[PDB]
Amino acid sequence: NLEDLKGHSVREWVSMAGPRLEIHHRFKNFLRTHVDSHGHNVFKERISDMCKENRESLVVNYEDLAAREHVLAYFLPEAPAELLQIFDEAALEVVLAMYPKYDRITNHIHVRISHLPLVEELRSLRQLHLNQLIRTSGVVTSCTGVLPQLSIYQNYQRIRIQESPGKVAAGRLPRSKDAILLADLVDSCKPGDEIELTGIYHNNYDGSLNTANGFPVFATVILANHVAKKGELTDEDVKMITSLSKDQQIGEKIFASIAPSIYGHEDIKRGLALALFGGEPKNPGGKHKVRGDINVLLCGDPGTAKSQFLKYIEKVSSRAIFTTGQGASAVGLTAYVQRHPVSREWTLEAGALVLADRGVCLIDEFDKMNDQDRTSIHEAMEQQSISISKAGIVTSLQARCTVIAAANPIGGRYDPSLTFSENVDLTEPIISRFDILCVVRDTVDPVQDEMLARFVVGSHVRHHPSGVEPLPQEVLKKYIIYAKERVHPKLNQMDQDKVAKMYSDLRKESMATGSIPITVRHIESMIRMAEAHARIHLRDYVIEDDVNMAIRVMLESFIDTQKFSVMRSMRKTFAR
Amino acid sequence: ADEGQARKSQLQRRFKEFLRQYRVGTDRTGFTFKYRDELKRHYNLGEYWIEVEMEDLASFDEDLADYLYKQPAEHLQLLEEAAKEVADEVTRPRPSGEEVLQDIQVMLKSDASPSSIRSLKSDMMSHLVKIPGIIIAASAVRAKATRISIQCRSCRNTLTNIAMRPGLEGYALPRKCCPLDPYFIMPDKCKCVDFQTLKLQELPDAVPHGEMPRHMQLYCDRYLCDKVVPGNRVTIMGIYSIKGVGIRSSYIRVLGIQVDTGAVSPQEEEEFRRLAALPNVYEVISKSIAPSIFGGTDMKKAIACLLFGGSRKRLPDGLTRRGDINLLMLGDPGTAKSQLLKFVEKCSPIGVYTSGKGSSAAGLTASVMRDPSSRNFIMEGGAMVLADGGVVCIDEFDKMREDDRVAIHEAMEQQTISIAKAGITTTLNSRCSVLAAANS
Amino acid sequence: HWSLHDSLCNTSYTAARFKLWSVHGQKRLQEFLADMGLPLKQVKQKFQAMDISLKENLREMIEESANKFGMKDMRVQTFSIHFGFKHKFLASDVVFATMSLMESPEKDGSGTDHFIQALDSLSRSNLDKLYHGLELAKKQLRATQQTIASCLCTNLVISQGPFLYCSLMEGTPDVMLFSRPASLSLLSKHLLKSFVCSTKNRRCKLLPLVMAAPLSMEHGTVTVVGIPPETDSSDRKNFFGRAFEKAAESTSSRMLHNHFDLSVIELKAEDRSKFLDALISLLS
Ligand SMILES: Nc1ncnc2c1ncn2[C@@H]1O[C@H](COP(=O)(O)OP(=O)(O)NP(=O)(O)O)[C@@H](O)[C@H]1O
Numbered sequence A: 001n002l003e004d005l006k007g008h009s010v011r012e013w014v015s016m017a018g019p020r021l022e023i024h025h026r027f028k029n030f031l032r033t034h035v036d037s038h039g040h041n042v043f044k045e046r047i048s049d050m051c052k053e054n055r056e057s058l059v060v061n062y063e064d065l066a067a068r069e070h071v072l073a074y075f076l077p078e079a080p081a082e083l084l085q086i087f088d089e090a091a092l093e094v095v096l097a098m099y100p101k102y103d104r105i106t107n108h109i110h111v112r113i114s115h116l117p118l119v120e121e122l123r124s125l126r127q128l129h130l131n132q133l134i135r136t137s138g139v140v141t142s143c144t145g146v147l148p149q150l151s152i153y154q155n156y157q158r159i160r161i162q163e164s165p166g167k168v169a170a171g172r173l174p175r176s177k178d179a180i181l182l183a184d185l186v187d188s189c190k191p192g193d194e195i196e197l198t199g200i201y202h203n204n205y206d207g208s209l210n211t212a213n214g215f216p217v218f219a220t221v222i223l224a225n226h227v228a229k230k231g232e233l234t235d236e237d238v239k240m241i242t243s244l245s246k247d248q249q250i251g252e253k254i255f256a257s258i259a260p261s262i263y264g265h266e267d268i269k270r271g272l273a274l275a276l277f278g279g280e281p282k283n284p285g286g287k288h289k290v291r292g293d294i295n296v297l298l299c300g301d302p303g304t305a306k307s308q309f310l311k312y313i314e315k316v317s318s319r320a321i322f323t324t325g326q327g328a329s330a331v332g333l334t335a336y337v338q339r340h341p342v343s344r345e346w347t348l349e350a351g352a353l354v355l356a357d358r359g360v361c362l363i364d365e366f367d368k369m370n371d372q373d374r375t376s377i378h379e380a381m382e383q384q385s386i387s388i389s390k391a392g393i394v395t396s397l398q399a400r401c402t403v404i405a406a407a408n409p410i411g412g413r414y415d416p417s418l419t420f421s422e423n424v425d426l427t428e429p430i431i432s433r434f435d436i437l438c439v440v441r442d443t444v445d446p447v448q449d450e451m452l453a454r455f456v457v458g459s460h461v462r463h464h465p466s467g468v469e470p471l472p473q474e475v476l477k478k479y480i481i482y483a484k485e486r487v488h489p490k491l492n493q494m495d496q497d498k499v500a501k502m503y504s505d506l507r508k509e510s511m512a513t514g515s516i517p518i519t520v521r522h523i524e525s526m527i528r529m530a531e532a533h534a535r536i537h538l539r540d541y542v543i544e545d546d547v548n549m550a551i552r553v554m555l556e557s558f559i560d561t562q563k564f565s566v567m568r569s570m571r572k573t574f575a576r
Numbered sequence B: 001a002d003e004g005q006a007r008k009s010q011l012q013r014r015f016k017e018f019l020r021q022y023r024v025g026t027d028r029t030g031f032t033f034k035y036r037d038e039l040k041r042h043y044n045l046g047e048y049w050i051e052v053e054m055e056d057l058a059s060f061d062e063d064l065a066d067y068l069y070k071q072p073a074e075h076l077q078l079l080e081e082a083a084k085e086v087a088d089e090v091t092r093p094r095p096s097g098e099e100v101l102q103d104i105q106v107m108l109k110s111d112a113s114p115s116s117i118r119s120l121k122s123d124m125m126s127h128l129v130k131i132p133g134i135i136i137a138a139s140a141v142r143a144k145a146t147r148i149s150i151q152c153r154s155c156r157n158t159l160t161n162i163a164m165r166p167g168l169e170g171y172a173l174p175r176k177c178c179p180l181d182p183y184f185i186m187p188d189k190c191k192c193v194d195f196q197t198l199k200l201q202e203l204p205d206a207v208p209h210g211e212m213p214r215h216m217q218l219y220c221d222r223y224l225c226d227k228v229v230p231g232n233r234v235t236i237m238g239i240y241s242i243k244g245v246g247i248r249s250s251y252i253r254v255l256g257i258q259v260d261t262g263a264v265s266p267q268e269e270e271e272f273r274r275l276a277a278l279p280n281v282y283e284v285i286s287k288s289i290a291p292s293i294f295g296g297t298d299m300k301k302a303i304a305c306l307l308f309g310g311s312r313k314r315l316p317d318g319l320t321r322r323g324d325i326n327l328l329m330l331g332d333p334g335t336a337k338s339q340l341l342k343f344v345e346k347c348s349p350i351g352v353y354t355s356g357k358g359s360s361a362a363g364l365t366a367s368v369m370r371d372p373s374s375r376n377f378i379m380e381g382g383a384m385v386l387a388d389g390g391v392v393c394i395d396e397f398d399k400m401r402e403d404d405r406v407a408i409h410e411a412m413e414q415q416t417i418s419i420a421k422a423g424i425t426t427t428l429n430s431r432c433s434v435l436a437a438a439n440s
Numbered sequence C: 001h002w003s004l005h006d007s008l009c010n011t012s013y014t015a016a017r018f019k020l021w022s023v024h025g026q027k028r029l030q031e032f033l034a035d036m037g038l039p040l041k042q043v044k045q046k047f048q049a050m051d052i053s054l055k056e057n058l059r060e061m062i063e064e065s066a067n068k069f070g071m072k073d074m075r076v077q078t079f080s081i082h083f084g085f086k087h088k089f090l091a092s093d094v095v096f097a098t099m100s101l102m103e104s105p106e107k108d109g110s111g112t113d114h115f116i117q118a119l120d121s122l123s124r125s126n127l128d129k130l131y132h133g134l135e136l137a138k139k140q141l142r143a144t145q146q147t148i149a150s151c152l153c154t155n156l157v158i159s160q161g162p163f164l165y166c167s168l169m170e171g172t173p174d175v176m177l178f179s180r181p182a183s184l185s186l187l188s189k190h191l192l193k194s195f196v197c198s199t200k201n202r203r204c205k206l207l208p209l210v211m212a213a214p215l216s217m218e219h220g221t222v223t224v225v226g227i228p229p230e231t232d233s234s235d236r237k238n239f240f241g242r243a244f245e246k247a248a249e250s251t252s253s254r255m256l257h258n259h260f261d262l263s264v265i266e267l268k269a270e271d272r273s274k275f276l277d278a279l280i281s282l283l284s
């Protein structure tokens, strides 16, 4: 029996021929026999996906390894450099048994472990942990270029990670460690990333430390084995996702599933949904690029859940950033220049709009920025780049993000006796860069008060620590990441006469009231909204229903800009 | 070994036959010898280089192309030697003063598909590769030895015609004929050549989301020197090789350069003469400018005049007149101002685009800073220096600070930049057009 | 004359078999390449620049894998010509090049100029024209495939009972290229093959197809073409000539018979409804 630890350390024991062969056979049999709760083979699918894409890297989960072959799971953290070697040798021949020609592509395969339970904090490492497998977290601050290392040659890269800001105590200082990335792990990260790192804790001698301290004290480092941020959908995932698209009422299910605890506010949920999926960028004829993203602005009375919506958007989306008013500077929003700490030369670094890239950039208290800071985002919001010329540097950076902002009306409360422009105090070059504009107001209906209050009280008793039905939030997250990566809507035809007539009439009326000026941007905006609605239904081609939806959203948000007494006439004018 | 020498000799013969037998054409018209004629005409003009194409060699004999793909360093020198001995019989006998045979540089070219820097698996060491990118740094020229002679300090014995390897690697002298470091180099007997180094940046569209762009080091030699400058987009062909205890650096030895974008051919001149001749050329050019943007025909006409420019003049009492043209657009939002700037930057032969909100006085004209090496102060060129002879597009023009717009008053009129800082005083050139956009 | 991957995407037969207008089809294609053991880097490189070790044995690999997947008919009997050091062509490359030169869509003067270029390219002294014609052919094939995908996803093919009916519309992708009878007829054939391989409904898999396309909207005219039913062993005999004539006469249609094949005609747009009713009722 393999478990018979006698007269030997585990490192010595697994070096013996008998134990080595037992470990080898057990992992191989585990690979071939492991089944999911449905009776499906797990690793047949995973190996086949690895081979089809030529990726040469196999991920294993610690939890079900333990659940089925605990003896190996018991040894694994005590002697990682031994068991991981045996595991690599065992996996390659399973791959060649299934795909006999795969030695043409690669001659080695690496096994990578995940969901290891024994997480440790980055300042609680001690000599008790040396030469064992551990898991930690932090943010990357330094990152070398990828360089070749002797072995034959393989890629090598070195990084420095420190405690995540706001997880250190107030007013004190963070700890940090170095880590090493080899082979397919290089460029798995870049500066400012927050990551989860699994690796081996390792130490070596260094004369500099001994001479600086006067005692024989060693230096330490982490050998990375698996790195992940804090698509890989199964067949069952895509099957359920595609099946859901059959429902004629899918729009109600998706819209009703945004910020679920907020009562009311249908228009806000709809607008945020379209902005979350987004239209598609294009460059007709190569010389005339136009953006895909849909920007949103919210404005209105205090106590109406405006700040809460942004926090929900931050949680559900990925690559999200959040910032507030006076807490941000022009240079921090775009990009900055510095004397580099160790290279001793001027260097340029990314700000918020660059670091977000193909993500969401959330702004709050947008009314209260310094005007010289607020005007920094004009290029990034439309041209979708950031151009800089300072300290001998001349370059440009990508800024491919969606901006969402919240503001307050002048004097603290909105007046329906005045138009939007009169009540918000923002200039036309800013107002015209937002695709969707919303106004939120207090109301005084007693039945609505009773329903809202009863709902809030219900929410409080529901969450004590202890329309249609919405989706679970994980299902919605899977749905969004599928739709943005596997569907790309085409606009093969639409009615030019209808849109042109409507636009000309609309622009003429906009000149009359002056609530907002209407420009060429509005047409291009409707094209973006039409594509977004097409994407929610997982359709490859835009259809008549999508164009009608886009026109409805556009005109409904436009009527609210007017004075209360004018809105009736305007609404009857643009009957749809 | 004699077997190795025999193999070298045999391969050299095969390369020689390729050069002196290859032909193009058909019997329905007539045949020409592609590489013989090029060697003759280039040698008679004092060039000493040719540009062989991989597609042709691969068609003449597949084995030679295979060897030259897998073992370029070992075989390219046989090809260079073959080219030399063919040039001799193609030109001999030469006039008085010409009787000594010169050395030929062989460059390579191909039609195959590129690969990105990120694609370089370390299986590719010493294999021939083709890479696209942008040049971001460029050294000044230096002298590099090809063959030397040395002499002994204590007893004056000598060794001579000692061959030096190409690329970024060095050499060490003997210790026999004495002290431990007995030999010294004779500089008067060094056969030296020009050499330069560059740094390459991976293409913006090739790098994925969530990663850094990779970058690479390049070596440049003889006729390839001062062929490019930073900011250019180019395609490179070369050898890929190497230059904690186990770290070593790596770089690429360049064998051919193609600027993705030269002197105009006679055919091209005839087409340009035709374009200049035909009568309504002004409207034709006006329609070519920014063709997607609706309306604005007068504005497009003014932009055409900006691109062609006036003419420079020097007057009899030594003063100058600037010739080139400045243009400003001011008014309402959503009227396609930024689009026109974005087009003119691509249409002009030389052009740069910058934002007024994101730029500084020292960044627009020129700057002074300490060298990262040595300890000395050195000069740097801003946007208005890089665009010398071309167009500068300043976007968001009304959002600069007052003290920064003051900095370009000399450059916009006198077309020169006067500097006096850190103990250095000089005058630099900036002969460029300004195109700007603003709001009320 | 281009990459292996491009050939598999743009060949009519494999595109239909793997359903490559759908994203799931691309996964099936990758499974095929994985069975052969071709690295994706090799497959994306031009055939002339592929590794010589793979080139020498490619035809056997492709036939074996295709046979396993149920594609029983990957080889054909043909001829090829070789001259000089590096000019080699299969008998079909010359056909696609010549055809593309002749039916070129651009109004580069009168149509006879295109004919003249097609005729000249058949001589060895004018080889540069052959190489130009191949580049026209590549674009033609790509346009055809994205048109077929648009037609299926937008669901333009409609059963009328005794025949399948379909029509293109102005401004949509590459419609100008399908204004002429040659290109239009070949497109329609590929469309029918794609549809029959796609659908499971047995009653749909044995039908003829009638296709209509814009000819001249300023004349108010449309071109109409009919195809026989699609089966492998069909005699290629088709009956739409006398059917169109009888239906037009019974309808008193404003129509014209112009091309040398009797299966293609010109119609006035306003008459198309009653003309289709006459055809449906006549075929019964
Ligand atoms: N309809 C609602 N449903 C649930 N909670 C609500 C609702 N309206 C307000 N609240 C609560 O009111 C509090 C304030 O929310 P908040 O998002 O800051 O409103 P606000 O209008 O943005 N306030 P302010 O930032 O001063 O303008 C939070 O605890 C919300 O959860």
Ligand SMILES: Nc1ncnc2c1ncn2[C@@H]1O[C@H](COP(=O)(O)OP(=O)(O)NP(=O)(O)O)[C@@H](O)[C@H]1O
Pocket (backbone or CB within 6 Å): A290, A382, A429, A520, A521, A524, B292, B293, B294, B295, B332, B333, B334, B335, B336, B337, B338, B339, B340
């Ligand atoms: N005549 C036009 N033709 C095509 N697109 C146009 C036209 N006029 C405006 N646009 C659109 O207007 C949008 C904004 O373009 P932009 O170049 O920023 O105009 P602008 O005058 O610079 N706006 P601004 O930066 O606010 O002053 C783009 O989406 C263009 O496609």
Ligand SMILES: [Mg+2]
Pocket (backbone or CB within 6 Å): A303, A305, A306, A307, A308
């Ligand atoms: Mg709030």
Ligand SMILES: [Mg+2]
Pocket (backbone or CB within 6 Å): A382, B336, B337, B338, B339
């Ligand atoms: Mg603009």
Ligand SMILES: [Zn+2]
Pocket (backbone or CB within 6 Å): B152, B154, B155, B156, B157, B176, B177, B178, B182
């Ligand atoms: Zn001596």
